[model samples]
Each structure stands twice: as C-alpha cells, then as structure tokens.
Target: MTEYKLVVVGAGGVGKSALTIQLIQNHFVDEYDPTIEDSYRKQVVIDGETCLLDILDTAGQEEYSAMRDQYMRTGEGFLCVFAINNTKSFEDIHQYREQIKRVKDSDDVPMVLVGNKCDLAARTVESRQAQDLARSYGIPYIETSAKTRQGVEDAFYTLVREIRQH
Candidate 1:
C-alpha cells in the first residue's frame, strides 16, 4: 500500500491538534485540550493513486520535544502552523523549520506554512507577512480555520500534492 507521512508542527496553543482532528475525524474541538501525542491515519486518492495520508498530532510545547526528531526523521512533509492572534507563535515557525531541516537532513523536505484560527478579529500577524515568509522559505502559505473548516482540505491536500511533485 502507498503511504505518505505527514506531521503537524507548531508552537503551543496554535491549534495543531485541532487541524489534524478535523482532517481525520471531521470534527473540531475549539476548546483547549492538550494531547501530548496522537496518530491518525486515512486512505485517499490524491491523484488516482490510493495512498495513506498518515498524520502525527504532536505536542507543541516542550513536553514532546524528546520525540520531535523522531517524527521529523519519519515525516515526508509537515503542516507548519501558527496563529494569527499570536505573534510569538508566528516567530516560532523559524525555529521549528531549522529543527526540522536539521533533523531530517534535507532542505528539500516538503512543508506548508499554515495560519490557523483564521476568522478571529485580533489580527496581529498579517496575511501578507506570512505569504512573504513562505516565499522566502520556498513553500506555500495558507490560512485555515479549524472551527470553520475552510481551507482545511486545501492545506493538508496541498501538502500531499507538494510532496508528490517533489
């Protein structure tokens, strides 16, 4: 069976788990819930080929740092997430990218810069800023609302597409 490894990476309180759960379970938990780690699997035809889109809902904070490289080594791509309301979380993406690149030992690894919780009004991290950053990183940038369910498929599915092409 064909399989693709994908992991959700982000700072604490960035709704990484929410995105994964919404994608796999088709449900979103708006409230805060700290899940140290979880693995979700799904079978889908991305481009006429049936493949498993494997996702690892990883811990965002220091609690799961020990296993960071564990998934990084195995993941084919990542959904690098951050929140629009939180500026610090946005900056954390740089650190996560460096860590992932260093651990994976490949700059060619596929990635998507995701801004979660998009409908909120407290917009500190502007959309253009994220777009520019992704351009520099040579990855696509997408905004998503875990609760609203818009752009969710585009984010995950597009990551699969990038991995497919590369």
Candidate 2:
C-alpha cells in the first residue's frame, strides 16, 4: 500500500473543511465554525493502486500561521485552496504556496491550486485568473463547489496523481 500526506491550506471560511468533508462523506454541510486543525484518513484505490491518504487540514486563521510551516514540512502534497467569491482568499494563496516551496525547499513540489466555492454566483476570482496563477507556478488549477460536489473529486484525485508522479 502507498501512503500520501496532503495538507490543505487557505484563508479562513474558504471551504477547506467543506471540500475535505465532501471527499470523505460524499455529503455537504451548510455551515461549520472556524477550524483550528483537523486530520483525516481515507483508504482509496487510484489507478489500481491502493493508497492510504492522510490529509492534514490546517487552520486558516492568522493565528495558525506559525503552525503551517510545520505542516508544510511534513506534507508530501498540498492543496492550496481559495474561495472563488473572495478575492482576498484568492490573493492570499500566494503566501501559502511560497511557504510550502520555502519549507519543502523545492520548486517542483506536488501541489494543486484549488478555487473553491464555485457554487456562489458572485465570484470574484474568475477561472481564467485562477488558471493564470496556476500556470505561473506550473501547477494544476481546479475549480470545485463543495455545495454542489462539482469538481471536488477531480481536485483531490489530481493532487494524488501528482503526488504519485512526484
């Protein structure tokens, strides 16, 4: 069996927990309070390979910035998430990516740039803009709606695929 450690990072209220929960439960939540930190494990088979995926969902609040470095150090792959409806969350993704690169000390880290909350109509971060940012970093850009379950599986599967390749 293969093991992968993935870290989920983003600004607060950007739906990090929602996406992760959707992956494990195949269900959606209407509301969740601020998350300090959480860990989840799932047994999955991807491309005929059994995988034990360990996901570390990090806190998005500013107070948890210090803890993120430690998470980055241990994560084999990362999902840098942002809310499509929040420009600030989209903009803040840079900080998370930079930190991961710095901690991992590699520019070719396995990562996926995720634009969550795509179900919202008033989206501030357009798909083209998100793609541009991902292209700049040479990573995959995926848009997912935790509420609608659209593209949510693709995002994690993509990340795990990249992790296996890396």
Candidate 3:
C-alpha cells in the first residue's frame, strides 16, 4: 500500500485536534483541550484505493515552533484549518501557508484550507469568503463540523487525493 504523511496546522481552540480525532476515530470530542503534538497512523481507503496515512496532529500554540517546522518539512500534504467563529484563526492561515512553502521549498504543495465548526449559526467566516481565499491560493476549501461529523471525511479524502496528484 502507498503511504503518505499529513500535517494539521491552525491556531489553538480551532478544532484541529477534534477534526483529526473525528476523522480517524469517528468520535466527536465536546471539550476543547489543547493538543501537545501527537501523531496517528491508519489505513484509509480513498476512492477504493488503500493507503497508510501518517497524520501529525500539531499543537496550535506557537510554543512548538521548532516542532512545527519539523512537521512542515516532513509532511507530504497539509490541512490548514481555522474555526468559522474566529476570524483571527482564519487570518493566521497566511503565515501557516508561508511556513509550509518555506519548509517544503515549493509553493505547489498539496494543501487544503479548512474552516471548522461549520455547524455554528453565529459564524464569523462565511463559506464564500473562505472559498474566495482558497481560490486565490488555488487550493481547495472545505467546511467541517466535528460536532455533527459533517464533511470530516471529505476534508481528509480531498487532501489525500491532492497528495496523490501532486
């Protein structure tokens, strides 16, 4: 089976960990606990093709800058996530994208801009705005809700497909 390394990066409390856990385990976590750098391995079948996925679920806090750089270097694909309720998290993705490009030494890296917490009615970041931003970057934009498990699988699936094509 083919193998791939994926990294999840975003600001704290933006549901990065929750989304990763929900994707891998299909379990929704209600509480928000900061992640301290964790990796998960699983065999996922995307489009009927089996592949081993090594997912580095990273801490959103800037305390692990060194570790985050290491992750960016090793990752074959990236999911740059932000919470829909927090525009600051959305704005922070620009830095994350630049960091990935710097580390990977390529601007055409496979990446997805993810807006989490889409189930919220009081969203500060609208789908069109996020889509427009992703369009400018020429990357895919997806909205997910870990609470209802909506679009969780599609986010990872799309990233993996991008990695395969990239």
lDDT of 2 by residue, 1-166 (tens): 6898988998998999999999988899788777777889999888888888899888898875556687668899999999999999988999988888898999889999999988899988999999999999989999999999999889999999998787
Candidates in order, TM-scores: namely 0.95, 0.95, 0.96
- Runs off by more than 4 Å, candidate 1: none
Q: What is the lDDT of residue 64 in candidate 3?
A: 54
Estimate the lDDT of model 2.
0.90
lDDT on C-alpha atoms for all candidate structures: 0.90, 0.90, 0.90
Q: lDDT tens digits, residues 1-166, model 3?
A: 6998999998988998899899889899999777878999999788888889899998888765446787668999999999999999999999999999999999999999999999999899989999999999999999999889999999988999899887
- Distance from true location, Cα of 5 in model 1, Å: 0.4
Off by over 4 Å in 2: none
Backbone clash total for model 2 is 0
Candidate 3 lDDT for residue 47: 86
